[PDB]
Amino acid sequence: AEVTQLSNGIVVATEHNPSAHTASVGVVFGSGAANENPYNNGVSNLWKNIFLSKENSAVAAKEGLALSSNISRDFQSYIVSSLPGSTDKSLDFLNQSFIQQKANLLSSSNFEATKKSVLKQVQDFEENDHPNRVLEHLHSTAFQNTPLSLPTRGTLESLENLVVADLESFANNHFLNSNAVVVGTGNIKHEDLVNSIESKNLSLQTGTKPVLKKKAAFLGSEVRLRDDTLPKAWISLAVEGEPVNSPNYFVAKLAAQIFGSYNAFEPASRLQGIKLLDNIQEYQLCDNFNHFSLSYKDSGLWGFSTATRNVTMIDDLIHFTLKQWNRLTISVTDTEVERAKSLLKLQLGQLYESGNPVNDANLLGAEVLIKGSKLSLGEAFKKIDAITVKDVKAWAGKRLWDQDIAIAGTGQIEGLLDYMRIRSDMSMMRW
Amino acid sequence: EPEHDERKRLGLKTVIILSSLYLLSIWVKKFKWAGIKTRKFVFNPPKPR
């Protein structure tokens, strides 16, 4: 399905969907918040809001175009959406506003206003979005003193000292042909997109991105942000996981699907075939939880997140969930593996067939920027169907059984026990 | 004191075993207390409500 060409230093990747009603083109760079430093943290967040500023969007609206941008730890993207008969109109807008003529966007009275608004978005996030700011501190403590520990939005102190010359420095080092992929998804054709870049002579700078010194290194630790005025307790807990291109990439995702997610107020979520629900529903230990498997270029995280109002029984919630992780290493049934196989395929099928061309562009560019190509959905289903119980036991034995953990929490967390008490629950003396 | 000879021999095994247990206990205690001993607190005064 997907086609990738290297006509020049830039790479062109596409995904033709003839039964769609929109098209999207854009550029994805192989740099994110992991390519900054504590003192300029949030520069890549400021660049996203410059692309989506009022003056830039007014020009695109008059032509019937919509702008989208996303910042991650390993990549950032700038997308333009349009009707199927106006693909060359979007390529021209991307060229004249981003690839070249970037000084008018970076003008004064536009940098100042955009900077003032981003400072407000960051302050609100740090005071209202408790479940998401806890997951950001989990990265901060698991990979402390490392590129992989910097928040994707920046901090109030990095942004407050950012100045006029700081944004131009970053784009020189990172917005280059060797660091970029041009992506077209929706009702577009590979031949029609390549024939348009070769005519307009589109090209970025011809440098090379700097090479970092350190690498990602997991360290067992914890950070606690207690706040007795909040009504709940939010907690995140994880061990070291798998990076992308790991052989055990789908085993770790299947292992997270065995315990899944839960919502106390949804009647159908209380009937799921998860044995953990039998210990936590009698006394209402939590309101919701979800298990994840995050994968980056160098490392990853594997764990779960919870929000609860039962502040006097937090230890029971942590004790019971970790004792269920113990069964992956020693005793996990065939039915649990077969059920998780069917729910992982459904979950992946929804993510890669959402029908939104903007979502597909982000997933396509990020995959090509690392692996060089993109694995087919049918090929992924074959690998998922081949996992056995012996593969789960081997994986969990080396990653989960008696291993260090990282913990982050906020709210009413007086009932969360010490590190060593929680750490000692990662195995058991009975086996 | 007809037990004098055997008492002194048994006291040599007690002291050696109990001295090595006492030293091995100091290390184990310090290993379990490492997280608490090296712990850092910071204070950012909250803004008025």
Curated annotation (Swiss-Prot), chain A:
Subcellular location: Mitochondrion inner membrane
Gene Ontology CC, one term: mitochondrion
Topological relation to the membrane, as annotated: Peripheral membrane protein
The protein's role, per its UniProt record: Component of the ubiquinol-cytochrome c oxidoreductase, a multisubunit transmembrane complex that is part of the mitochondrial electron transport chain which drives oxidative phosphorylation.
Signal peptide extent: none
Leftover remarks: Present with 19300 molecules/cell in log phase SD medium.
Record bears the keyword Disulfide bond: no
Main location: mitochondrion
Keyword annotations from UniProtKB, A to Z: Electron transport, Membrane, Mitochondrion, Mitochondrion inner membrane, Respiratory chain, Transit peptide, Transport
Family membership noted in the UniProt record: Belongs to the peptidase M16 family. UQCRC1/QCR1 subfamily.
Protein name: Cytochrome b-c1 complex subunit 1, mitochondrial
GO molecular-function terms, A-Z: metal ion binding; metalloendopeptidase activity
Record keyword Electron transport present: yes
InterPro entries: Metalloenz_LuxS/M16 (IPR011249), MPP/UQCRC_Complex (IPR050361), Pept_M16_N (IPR011765), Peptidase_M16_C (IPR007863)
One GO term (biological process): proton transmembrane transport
SUPFAM superfamilies: LuxS/MPP-like metallohydrolase
Subunit: Component of the ubiquinol-cytochrome c oxidoreductase (cytochrome b-c1 complex, complex III, CIII), a multisubunit enzyme composed of 10 subunits. The complex is composed of 3 respiratory subunits cytochrome b (COB), cytochrome c1 (CYT1) and Rieske protein (RIP1), 2 core protein subunits COR1 and QCR2, and 5 low-molecular weight protein subunits QCR6, QCR7, QCR8, QCR9 and QCR10.
From Swiss-Prot, chain B:
Parts of the chain on the Mitochondrial matrix side: 38-49
Note: Present with 39900 molecules/cell in log phase SD medium.
Native source species: Saccharomyces cerevisiae (strain ATCC 204508 / S288c)
Record family assignment: Belongs to the cytochrome c family.
Impact when changing K29L: Loss of CYT1 and COB from the bc1 complex
Shown residues in whole-protein numbering: 260 to 308 of 309
Membrane-spanning ranges: 4-37
Location(s), subcellular: Mitochondrion inner membrane
Subunit structure of this chain's protein: Component of the ubiquinol-cytochrome c oxidoreductase (cytochrome b-c1 complex, complex III, CIII), a multisubunit enzyme composed of 10 subunits. The complex is composed of 3 respiratory subunits cytochrome b (COB), cytochrome c1 (CYT1) and Rieske protein (RIP1), 2 core protein subunits COR1 and QCR2, and 5 low-molecular weight protein subunits QCR6, QCR7, QCR8, QCR9 and QCR10.
Protein name: Cytochrome c1, heme protein, mitochondrial
Function of the molecule: Component of the ubiquinol-cytochrome c oxidoreductase, a multisubunit transmembrane complex that is part of the mitochondrial electron transport chain which drives oxidative phosphorylation.
Tree of life domain: Eukaryota
